[PDB]
């Protein structure tokens, strides 16, 4: 299956189950869970998006600008 991780910079990706360590080609590391992993997806379909939400999103505090609204 497909696994989640988070790079140095706060980052995320996306690899086979089994990436203790990635690397990313721009010029860094990518440090994966703790424990096993971050967002097990099973579909790759479902990876990229799993790895979006792991991304730097600001979305949580729902008072400023509604859901529905803009963002």
Do not use: W
């Given at each position: 299956?497909?696994?989640?991780?988070?790079?140095?910079?706060?980052?995320?990706?996306?690899?086979?189950?089994?990436?203790?360590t990635?690397?990313?080609?721009?010029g860094?590391?990518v440090?994966?869970?703790?424990?096993?992993?971050?967002?097990?997806?099973?579909?790759?379909?479902?990876?990229?998006?799993?790895?979006?939400?792991?991304?730097?999103?600001?979305?949580?505090?729902?008072?400023?600008?509604?859901?529905?609204?803009?963002?």
């Amino acid at each position: 299956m497909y696994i989640i991780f988070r790079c140095d910079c706060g980052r995320a990706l996306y690899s086979r189950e089994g990436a203790k360590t990635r690397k990313c080609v721009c010029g860094r590391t990518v440090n994966v869970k703790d424990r096993r992993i971050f967002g097990r997806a099973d579909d790759f379909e479902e990876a990229s998006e799993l790895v979006r939400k792991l991304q730097e999103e600001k979305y949580g505090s729902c008072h400023f600008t509604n859901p529905s609204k803009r963002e």
